[PDB]
Every structure is written in structure tokens, then in C-alpha cells.
Antibody, heavy 219, light 211 residues
């Protein structure tokens, strides 16, 4: 295994700095691997940001973002980081970290391992935590669900029975209200005989606000 | 950017050429191109590196080429599993790389399906704060365009509504959702509300009422 995962604030204010780390597993940050950052403005396509050469610590950026940021590698935590100053609304994107596969010329163009991605939102607005409500059946035939109201920024993550459920779960993409706040809903299709025989609970986590909650879909 | 066609389409079992046109100082000068496959809401997968090579476990059905300042991906033996956005990238002069604007591959002739619509009322826990919402969830449909409208007591509602742009599931079918946002008086005013969803001219309707 080689694994990468992004970390960082989900919200940044205009003309702050946005910082992200990528934690590396299974290989040394010094192994000479073009530790690369890429962003995807949502539904608007990929942009290459830059790289750190693992074994020299030299770095280079996109000619739009050089003169405004740096990328660096931490030998103590085995991770690499993007610091991108003077943040603007345009900097709102999913940020990905990646590995340029060993010993290619320009391996930052040929990225074999990628991280999950982290959405970073640049806004003068405030974080707001979700309001969480259950959805329960008689009025849809076999489905339970949950509703996650008027939160900001994106995202919120949801699980059922503390990860005891994966099969038959489906969590819907959010919708943006005119208020700038989002909301979404989650469902699980349950074998109808189980209602009240088995307990059903949803776990919810809007980490940009540190809001973690659990809710009973109490039949 | 490098330039790609915004979209391309092809029938099952066929082969498709996806092209990326740059300039002499990127695609031309350097034999360093690559292709990425992206399913929605997920990280890109590397598909070809250099003009020609494949990573391990990437299928034999993928191949790469370059002529002059232009380069292309061939996908052969189309499955619906090949439905994705495809991005090109190339090394660019003095320690850069450049991406192409992306292209969306549509795999034609997939089996159609009309939506498994689900509908829920406000929670009693919600309307105790004297605000109330109806949740209509639209799942497992293809093609991906839907018409959707609400009714109060069998009459059309044109304010207090929001609806998603549809989204592809793991299985290549679409999901969407619609929400109606009300006060408790406006929930209580009507003995039933309905969400009506029309897909390929066929209509699914789901109905809800207090208790």
C-alpha cells in the first residue's frame, strides 16, 4: 500500500492564507517522488498547482500561483503541504494531493497515487452547523431517512448505525438555498419486518463547525 | 489550457478517440503526455503515462498516441464502466505541467429506467420550531433529465421550492432531489401535498398529508 490523505480547514476568509497537508503512508517523503497538488473548481475542470521534489526539497508552481504560494515537505511528520496566500473566491475548489510515479521525466505529469480530495471554500461568511431531523415510514414503503438542514460550508458526512450499515444506504447530493446555506438528506432501505425489531440511527458530522450528532429514526 | 472537445459519444463495444490539442512548447517539444479517468465525486485515475505506456491493472483497452502538437487516447471495447470525464496533461516549458479542459464520454444505448421516487413530510421535531419542509428523493433513473413540480390540494405550487441538478450514481443511473420550504401554518393549510416527477414523458407521483 501507498496512501495519501488531505487535511486542512474547510473554510477560509478572503485575503487569508489557505493551507493544506497531505499525510503520506508506506513510503518516505524523502524517496524522490514529485509530491504534487492539483485542484478542481467544482464542475469546472482540473488545474495543476505544483510539486515538491521529495529528495531535494525544491519546489515549483503554476505561473498563476507562484509569486503567491509555496509547497513544502515535512520530514518529521512524513507529509507535504501547500500554502496559498491572499485567498480569493476563485480559490474555492476541491484540492487533491498526488504522487508522481518514480523516476519518470516530469513525474508530476504522471500521477499514480491520489488522495480523496478536500473541498476548501473561500468566503467572508460564517460557518453554521446543521439542524438534524429524522424521516420515518408508515409514508414511503420500506425506506428510513434523515434530513440535514441549513448548514455551511460544504461538506457534511453521514453514516448509519455507526457503520453497521453500508448496504441499502444512499446519501443525496446537497442543494444550495438562496441563503447560501446547504441541505441534504440520507436514506436507508430496510427489510420492512425489521422496523422496531432492529434499532436505526444515523451518525452525522459537519466537521467545519465541529458539529457531530446522532439521531433516532424512532419508528 | 490544452484544448479537448467538451464531449464525445460512442455505442457499446465500439472504440473512441479522445484528443488533446496543445502548442509546440508543451505537447510538441516533449514526449510527456498522460491521461486521467474521472468518475464523478471521486479522485482521477491515471490511465496512460508518457505518450504510450499504461500503469499496472489499467485495462488493455486503453492506448495513447502523439502526432505533431496533438495527442490522443483510444478506448476500445466500450463498457458503461468507461463512462467518465477524461483529462489530458503534458509537461510544459521549465518545470510545469498543463491539463486539458476535460471531455465527458457518453456511452450510448444503456437500458432506460424511470425514477424510484420517495417522499417524506416535515419531522414533528422540525415543525415544533414553526418551520417545515417536504423532502422528495429521486433515485435510479436514466437518461438523466427530469421535470419535477409540487402540488397543494391538487393545485400547482411556484414559490418556496428548490431542486438539484441531477447527479450520477456508482451504477451510472442518476439521482436528484427536490425540497419544499414552508412555515407550520403553510404545512397545516392543506390536507395533502404531492411531488410529481416526469421522466421520458412517463410520470411518477407521490403524495403526503398530516398524520
Amino acid at each position: 500500500q501507498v496512501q495519501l490523505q488531505e487535511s486542512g480547514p474547510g473554510l477560509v476568509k478572503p485575503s487569508e492564507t489557505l493551507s493544506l497537508t497531505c499525510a503520506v503512508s508506506g513510503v518516505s517523503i524523502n524517496d524522490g517522488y514529485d509530491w504534487t497538488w492539483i485542484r478542481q473548481t467544482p464542475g469546472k475542470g482540473l488545474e495543476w498547482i505544483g510539486y515538491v521534489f521529495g529528495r531535494s526539497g525544491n519546489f515549483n508552481l503554476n505561473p498563476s500561483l507562484r509569486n503567491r504560494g509555496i509547497i513544502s515537505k515535512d520530514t518529521c511528520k512524513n507529509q507535504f503541504s501547500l500554502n496559498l496566500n491572499s485567498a480569493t473566491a476563485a480559490d474555492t475548489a476541491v484540492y487533491f494531493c498526488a504522487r508522481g510515479m518514480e523516476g519518470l521525466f516530469a513525474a508530476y505529469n504522471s500521477l499514480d497515487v491520489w488522495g480523496r480530495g478536500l473541498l476548501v471554500t473561500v468566503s467572508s461568511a460564517s460557518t453554521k452547523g446543521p439542524s438534524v431531523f429524522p424521516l420515518a415510514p408508515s409514508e414511503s414503503t420500506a425506506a428510513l431517512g434523515c434530513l440535514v438542514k441549513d448548514y455551511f460550508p460544504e461538506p457534511v458526512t453521514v453514516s448509519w448505525n455507526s457503520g453497521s450499515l453500508t448496504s441499502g444506504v444512499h446519501t443525496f447530493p446537497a442543494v444550495l438555498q438562496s441563503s447560501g446555506l446547504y441541505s441534504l438528506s440520507s436514506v436507508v432501505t430496510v427489510p420492512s419486518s425489521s422496523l422496531g425489531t432492529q434499532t436505526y440511527v444515523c451518525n452525522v458530522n459537519h466537521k467545519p463547525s465541529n458539529t457531530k450528532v446522532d439521531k433516532r429514526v424512532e419508528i | 489550457a490544452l484544448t479537448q472537445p467538451p464531449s464525445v459519444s460512442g455505442s457499446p463495444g465500439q472504440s473512441v478517440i479522445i484528443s488533446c490539442t496543445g502548442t509546440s512548447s508543451d505537447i510538441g517539444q516533449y514526449n510527456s503526455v498522460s491521461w486521467y479517468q474521472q468518475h464523478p465525486d471521486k479522485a482521477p485515475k491515471l490511465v496512460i503515462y508518457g505518450v504510450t505506456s499504461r500503469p499496472s491493472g489499467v485495462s488493455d483497452r486503453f492506448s495513447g498516441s502523439k502526432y505533431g502538437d496533438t495527442a490522443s487516447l483510444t478506448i476500445s471495447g466500450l463498457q458503461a464502466e468507461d463512462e467518465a470525464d477524461y483529462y489530458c496533461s503534458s509537461h510544459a516549458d521549465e518545470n510545469m505541467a498543463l491539463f486539458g479542459g476535460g471531455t465527458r464520454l457518453t456511452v450510448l444505448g444503456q437500458p432506460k429506467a424511470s425514477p424510484t421516487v420517495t417522499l417524506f413530510p416535515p419531522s414533528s421535531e422540525e415543525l415544533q420550531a414553526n418551520k417545515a419542509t417536504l423532502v422528495c428523493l429521486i433515485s435510479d433513473f436514466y437518461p438523466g433529465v427530469v421535470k419535477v413540480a409540487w402540488k397543494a390540494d391538487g393545485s400547482a405550487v411556484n414559490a418556496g421550492v428548490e431542486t438539484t441538478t441531477p447527479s450520477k450514481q456508482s451504477n451510472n443511473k442518476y439521482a436528484a432531489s427536490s425540497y419544499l420550504s414552508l412555515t407550520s401554518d403553510q404545512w397545516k393549510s392543506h390536507k395533502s401535498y404531492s411531488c410529481q416527477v416526469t421522466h421520458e414523458g412517463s410520470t411518477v407521483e407521490k403524495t403526503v398529508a398530516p398524520a
